[PDB]
C-alpha cells in the first residue's frame, strides 16, 4: 500500500495482479463481438438530493466519492448491482491518463463507478467471484464547454490536496457524470485495476465519452498530492494482455465515414 510508479511491482505484494485476465485492456472495436442480447443499461436512484452530503476522499491512489444506498444498476437478466463508490484516473499536464485504450490510443482521463452484485452482502464475499463486482467506465475528453456536473467535484479538490484528506460535498446527479447513451457499450470480464487485482469483475465501457474543459482536466491532474512526497498524477495501470478473452459490443459494426 502504495503509490503509482512506486516499487516493488504489484505482483510482489499481490500475486493475483499477475493473473491472466487482468484489467485494463485495449479495446479494438473491429474485433469486438456484437451481442444483440446486450440491452441498454438500467439505472435507478442515481439522482441524489443536495442533502445528505457525501464523503470525498484523497486516498493517495485517486479521489474517491462514497455513494449512499439505493443506487441500482442492471446489466441484464440475472445481473443486478448496487453502486458503492466512484473514482477517477488521469494523467498530467499535457499527458493522457485513461486506463482503457481504444485501438491503442489513450484518453485524457477515465471515471469508474464500482458496484457490488445483489447476490453478495459485502465486497469481501464478492472478491474474485465471477460477476461479484461490476465497474462502469467512461472516458473523459477535452471539449470547449465547462462540465457543470464535474465542476461540483473538481471545485472541491483543493481542500483535499494532501494525501488522506477528506471533505463532505452536496449530493448530485451521479448519472450526469456519465454519458447519456446507455445503449452503446463494450463489455468484458477482467479484474480490479488496483491491488488486490481480483478477477471475475464485469467491465462495461461506454462508447460515448464525456467532455470536460481544458481547465477542468488541468484541475483534476494538477491539484492532488499522493503518498509520501509524491504528486497524484499518472494514476493509471498499464494495459494488460487480453489472453484470448472476447470483448462484446452492444451495437453492430457501422462505418466511421462514407464517400459522397
Number of helices (H), then strands (E), in the chain: 4, 16
How far is C-alpha 34 from the geometric centre of its chain's CA atoms? 22
Asked if 115 is an active-site residue, the reply is: no
**Residue 19 in the binding site for Cl ion (CB under 5 A):** yes
Distance (Å, whole) CA 239 – CA 223: 25
Angle at CA 247, nearest 5°, toward 189 and 121? Answer: 25
- Please count the residues of this chain forming the interface with Zn ion, following the rule CB under 5 A: 3
> Considering the complex, what minimum distance in angstroms separates the CB of residue 106 from Zn ion?
11
Per CB under 5 A, the list member of 103, 158, 162, 173 interacting with Cl ion is: 103
> Considering the complex, what minimum distance in angstroms separates the CB of residue 60 from Zn ion?
5
**Residue 196 in the binding site for Cl ion (CB under 5 A):** no
Nearer to Zn ion, 2 or 120 (CB): 2
Question: By CB under 5 A, which span of 22-30, 120-128, 219-227, 242-250 interacts with Cl ion?
Answer: 22-30
Q: Which of residues 23-62 bind Cl ion (CB under 5 A)?
A: 28
Residue 204 · residue 187 · CB < 8 Å: yes
Residue 149 · residue 175 · CB < 8 Å: no
Q: Which three cell numbers stand for residue 14?
A: 499481490
Q: Is 193 annotated as a binding residue?
A: yes
Q: Cell 447519456 identifies what position?
A: 180
- Please count the residues of this chain forming the interface with Cl ion, following the rule CB under 5 A: 4
Per CB under 5 A, the list member of 112, 199, 212, 219 interacting with Zn ion is: 112
**Residue 251 in the binding site for Zn ion (CB under 5 A):** no
Q: Is 115 annotated as a binding residue?
A: no
Question: By CB under 5 A, which span of 62-70, 95-103, 119-127, 203-211 interacts with Cl ion?
Answer: 95-103
Instruction: Write out the DSSP string of 51-112.
Output: -S-EEEEE-SS-EEEEPPTT-EEEEETTEEEEEEEEEEEE-BTTB---SSEETTEEPSEEEE
**Residue 20 in the binding site for Cl ion (CB under 5 A):** yes
Distance (Å, whole) CA 36 – CA 250: 6
**Residue 100 in the binding site for Zn ion (CB under 5 A):** no
* Active-site annotation holder among 1, 61, 105, 218: 61
> Considering the complex, what minimum distance in angstroms separates the CB of residue 211 from Zn ion?
20
Q: Please tell me the number of Cα atoms within 13 Å of 152 on its side-chain side.
A: 17
**Residue 122 in the binding site for Zn ion (CB under 5 A):** no
Distance (Å, whole) CA 67 – CA 114: 10
Annotated binding-site ranges for Zn(2+): 87, 89, 112
Tell me which residues touch Cl ion (CB under 5 A). Answer: 19-20, 28, 103
Tell me which residues touch Zn ion (CB under 5 A). Answer: 1-2, 112
Annotated binding-site ranges for substrate: 193-194
Catalytically annotated residues: 61
Amino acid at each position: 500500500h502504495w503509490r503509482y510508479g512506486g516499487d516493488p511491482p504489484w505482483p510482489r505484494v499481490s500475486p493475483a495482479c499477475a493473473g491472466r485476465f487482468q484489467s485494463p485492456v485495449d479495446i479494438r472495436p473491429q474485433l469486438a463481438a456484437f451481442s444483440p442480447a446486450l440491452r441498454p443499461l438500467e439505472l435507478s436512484g442515481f439522482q441524489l438530493p443536495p442533502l445528505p452530503e457525501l464523503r470525498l476522499r484523497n486516498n493517495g491512489h485517486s479521489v474517491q466519492l462514497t455513494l449512499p444506498p439505493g443506487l441500482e444498476m442492471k446489466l441484464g437478466p440475472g445481473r443486478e448491482y448496487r453502486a458503492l463508490q466512484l473514482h477517477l484516473h488521469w494523467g498530467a499536464a499535457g499527458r493522457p491518463g485513461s486506463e482503457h485504450t481504444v485501438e491503442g490510443h489513450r484518453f485524457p482521463a477515465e471515471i469508474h463507478v464500482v458496484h457490488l452484485s445483489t447476490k453478495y452482502a459485502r465486497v469481501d464475499e464478492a472478491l474474485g467471484r465471477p460477476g461479484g463486482l461490476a465497474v462502469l467506465a467512461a472516458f473523459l475528453e477535452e471539449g470547449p464547454e465547462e462540465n457543470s456536473a464535474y465542476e461540483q467535484l473538481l471545485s472541491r479538490l483543493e481542500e483535499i490536496a494532501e494525501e488522506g484528506s477528506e471533505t463532505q460535498v452536496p449530493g448530485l446527479d451521479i448519472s450526469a457524470l456519465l454519458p447519456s447513451d446507455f445503449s452503446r457499450y463494450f463489455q468484458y470480464e477482467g479484474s480490479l485495476t488496483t491491488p488486490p487485482c481480483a478477477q471475475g469483475v464485469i467491465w462495461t465501457v461506454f462508447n460515448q465519452t464525456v467532455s470536460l474543459s481544458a481547465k477542468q482536466l488541468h484541475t483534476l491532474s494538477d491539484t492532488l498530492w499522493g503518498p509520501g512526497d509524491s504528486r497524484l498524477q499518472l494514476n493509471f495501470r498499464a494495459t494488460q494482455p487480453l489472453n484470448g478473452r472476447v470483448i462484446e459490443a452492444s451495437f453492430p459494426a457501422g462505418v466511421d465515414s462514407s464517400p459522397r
